[PDB]
Amino acid sequence: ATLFIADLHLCAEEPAITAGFLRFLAGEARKADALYILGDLFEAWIGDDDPNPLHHQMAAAIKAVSDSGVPCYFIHGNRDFLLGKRFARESGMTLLPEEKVLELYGRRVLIMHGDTLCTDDAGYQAFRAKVHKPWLQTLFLALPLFVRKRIAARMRANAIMDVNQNAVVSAMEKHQVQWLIHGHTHRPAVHELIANQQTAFRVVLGAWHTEGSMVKVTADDVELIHFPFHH
Amino acid sequence: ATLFIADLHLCAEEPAITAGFLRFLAGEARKADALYILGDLFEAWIGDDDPNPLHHQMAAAIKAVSDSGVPCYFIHGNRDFLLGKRFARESGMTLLPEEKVLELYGRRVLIMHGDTLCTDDAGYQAFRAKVHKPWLQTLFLALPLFVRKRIAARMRANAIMDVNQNAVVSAMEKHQVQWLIHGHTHRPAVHELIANQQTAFRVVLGAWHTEGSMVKVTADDVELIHFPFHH
Ligand SMILES: CN(c1ccccc1C(=O)Nc1ccc(S(=O)(=O)N2CCN(c3cc(Cl)cc(Cl)c3)CC2)cc1)S(C)(=O)=O
Ligand SMILES: CN(c1ccccc1C(=O)Nc1ccc(S(=O)(=O)N2CCN(c3cc(Cl)cc(Cl)c3)CC2)cc1)S(C)(=O)=O
Ligand SMILES: [Mn+2]
Ligand SMILES: [Mn+2]
Ligand SMILES: [Mn+2]
Ligand SMILES: [Mn+2]
């Protein structure tokens, strides 16, 4: 199967989640055709030059997957939009655009983090628009690391709005798909809807905390799977 | 794996759900070690003498699973507590008590429909207590079929309360388990909790409508899986 995960929100303060992720990478992921990480892999990102040991540990673990013959891909989330080409190289991941149609076993599937669908959160969308400006990213990344951390602390100190259903249909009609997989909203579920005047499905991943979750796609099956961290 | 499903609420008026169930029985179920149906297989049951064609269709489909070498088991729900030894024989299913500990790959797992945990719904628990009296079941079943239908229509005409968390811990301590699988509440989820002063897990199945759901247990994994009806 092809696997999709999102919303791991990895951080030093939550080692149980990291352990769960390492188990997933060392086991489940090795049997996959490909692995797609649809954003919020990390709880925060202020640049690829950050010496946070968790980053290099995760890079090595993800690179082990692609080195074993399982291609890995990443779409940015709202937490980790500054994850860059250096980390992608270190982790063996291919960076994808914010919205991407895959051809999976003949099925067209739209993938994204999901935050672009949450059009009712005006405050979040204003934030997203600003921090996605390349010139501002470049300027931020040019600050001293210690300053970026001070900004981050305040910004992190400074409930996730669910998707707008019209935005969902709009996106699925734009991309001409009957399948959409995303995360962001932390509301794991399978939804049936109508797009392109045909039955359509939206499959939502969950955040990693007590459980992990993944979506498995094969030719004949699409499954949303939750698993507790019980090892 | 060993499979668990619940809350299919099968009825003539919802053929899409029946089709989804037939696909599950003809495919997924055949690969299983065993199949456990944890109640609310049917939307209603007024006795095994009911000539509803759906009942015989489902009996044949379930019996095909056990005849292929996959043992099937049933725990009653609140909808189908009158499902009896005749239907069990016709369907090749073994009837289990309302609460049962399984030994699955060395792991003790408590299974039940889930309604016994919903102790905050006084009206439901009063109903359950009365209709579980064997003498009343026997008397009801002795009514003419057409009368049972008239009673049923009114009773069906006459939101599901979630579990009581204390009832959960109580049950898991009573049965000395760290794992519980149930349905009834139509809130599919994986929960972590504490029972027997140790980490415990409660895995909840969902109702069948737009999606099906199952729990898969192997030696190393416990998974809650949702799948859309997309065939
Ligand atoms: C949904 N989320 C939001 C809702 C509303 C508004 C914002 C968010 C949100 O994602 N905030 C958020 C996202 C990431 C981060 S961070 O990784 O610490 N970091 C990202 C990089 N930042 C940054 C980027 C630019 Cl180019 C310019 C500047 Cl000066 C600063 C600093 C903050 C800090 C905060 S939430 C509740 O999860 O925070
Ligand atoms: C959670 N549910 C309840 C909540 C509160 C109270 C009751 C229920 C509930 O399960 N009701 C319910 C359950 C089954 C059925 S039924 O299958 O049509 N049928 C079952 C058999 N009945 C019956 C049994 C005895 Cl031995 C005596 C009598 Cl004279 C009657 C008739 C009704 C009809 C109604 S819910 C909302 O799903 O109905
Ligand atoms: Mn997230
Ligand atoms: Mn997000
Ligand atoms: Mn039910
Ligand atoms: Mn029930």
Swiss-Prot record, chains A, B:
Please provide one cellular component term from the Gene Ontology annotations of this protein. cytoplasm
Query: EC number(s) for this protein?
Result: 3.6.1.54
Enzyme class, broadest EC rank: hydrolase
What are the GO BP annotations of this UniProt entry?
lipid A biosynthetic process
Supply the alphabetized keyword list: Cell inner membrane, Cell membrane, Hydrolase, Lipid A biosynthesis, Lipid biosynthesis, Lipid metabolism, Manganese, Membrane, Metal-binding
Which pathway, per its entry? Answer: Glycolipid biosynthesis; lipid IV(A) biosynthesis; lipid IV(A) from (3R)-3-hydroxytetradecanoyl-[acyl-carrier-protein] and UDP-N-acetyl-alpha-D-glucosamine: step 4/6
Q: What is its main location?
A: membrane
Q: What domain of life does the native source organism fall in?
A: Bacteria
Report residues binding Mn(2+) 1: 7, 9, 40, 186
Q: Which residues bind Mn(2+) 2?
A: 40, 78, 113, 184
Which residues make up the binding site for substrate?
78-79, 121, 184
Example GO molecular function: UDP-2,3-diacylglucosamine hydrolase activity
Please name the Pfam families in this protein's record: Metallophos
Q: How does it sit in the membrane?
A: Peripheral membrane protein
Cofactor, how bound (note): Binds 2 Mn(2+) ions per subunit in a binuclear metal center.
Q: What reaction gets catalysed by this protein?
A: UDP-2-N,3-O-bis[(3R)-3-hydroxytetradecanoyl]-alpha-D-glucosamine + H2O = 2-N,3-O-bis[(3R)-3-hydroxytetradecanoyl]-alpha-D-glucosaminyl 1-phosphate + UMP + 2 H(+)
Cofactor(s) demanded: Mn(2+)
UniProt record similarity statement: Belongs to the LpxH family.
Q: What is this protein called?
A: UDP-2,3-diacylglucosamine hydrolase
Q: Organism source for this protein? A: Escherichia coli O6:H1 (strain CFT073 / ATCC 700928 / UPEC)
As recorded in Swiss-Prot or TrEMBL, the protein's gene is named: lpxH
